[PDB]
Swiss-Prot record, chain A:
Name recorded for this polypeptide: Major capsid protein
Family statement: Belongs to the herpesviridae major capsid protein family.
Subcellular location, record wording: Virion; Host nucleus
Function (record text): Self-assembles to form an icosahedral capsid with a T=16 symmetry, about 200 nm in diameter, and consisting of 150 hexons and 12 pentons (total of 162 capsomers). Hexons form the edges and faces of the capsid and are each composed of six MCP molecules. In contrast, one penton is found at each of the 12 vertices. Eleven of the pentons are MCP pentamers, while the last vertex is occupied by the portal complex.
Subunit structure: Homomultimer. Makes the hexons and eleven out of twelve pentons. Interacts with triplex proteins 1/TRX1 and 2/TRX2; adjacent capsomers are linked together in groups of three by triplexes, heterotrimeric complexes composed of one molecule of TRX1 and two molecules of TRX2. Interacts with scaffold protein; this interaction allows efficient MCP transport to the host nucleus. Interacts with capsid vertex component 2/CVC2. Interacts with the small capsomere-interacting protein/SCP.
Curated annotation (Swiss-Prot), chain B:
Family: Belongs to the herpesviridae major capsid protein family.
Species this protein is from: Human cytomegalovirus (strain AD169)
Description of how the protein assembles with itself and partners: Homomultimer. Makes the hexons and eleven out of twelve pentons. Interacts with triplex proteins 1/TRX1 and 2/TRX2; adjacent capsomers are linked together in groups of three by triplexes, heterotrimeric complexes composed of one molecule of TRX1 and two molecules of TRX2. Interacts with scaffold protein; this interaction allows efficient MCP transport to the host nucleus. Interacts with capsid vertex component 2/CVC2. Interacts with the small capsomere-interacting protein/SCP.
Record's protein name: Major capsid protein
Localization in the cell: Virion; Host nucleus
Biological role: Self-assembles to form an icosahedral capsid with a T=16 symmetry, about 200 nm in diameter, and consisting of 150 hexons and 12 pentons (total of 162 capsomers). Hexons form the edges and faces of the capsid and are each composed of six MCP molecules. In contrast, one penton is found at each of the 12 vertices. Eleven of the pentons are MCP pentamers, while the last vertex is occupied by the portal complex.
Tree of life domain: Viruses
Length: 49, 49
């Protein structure tokens, strides 16, 4: 009896992503997370979205 | 009409009638909307930032 997932995942866009999608035609996942990690100097991310 | 003197022909009174007429001159300005603009006005897709 495999315990397979029951539902599709979902990947909402960030309100910060809406700006770089318009001015730069580009989206770097979790733009709010990279700002905090570069502020904190921490090199590693727990997960890549 | 001024009253005349002896031996000079008198002046008959003259009613005058006249009429003005109106003139037409209409105006027009075109303004256009791209269908891509209208389609976001009325249709609305998955509501995303």
């Amino acid at each position: 009896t495999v315990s397979a997932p029951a539902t599709y995942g979902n990947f909402v866009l960030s309100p910060e992503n809406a700006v770089t999608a318009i001015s730069y035609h580009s989206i770097l996942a979790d733009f709010n997370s990279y700002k905090a990690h570069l502020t904190s100097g921490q090199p590693h991310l727990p997960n890549d979205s | 009409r001024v009253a005349s003197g002896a031996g000079l022909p008198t002046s008959r009174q003259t009613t005058i009638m006249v009429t003005k007429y109106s003139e037409k001159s209409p105006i027009t300005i075109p303004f256009e909307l791209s269908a891509a603009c209208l389609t976001y006005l009325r249709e609305t897709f998955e509501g995303t930032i």
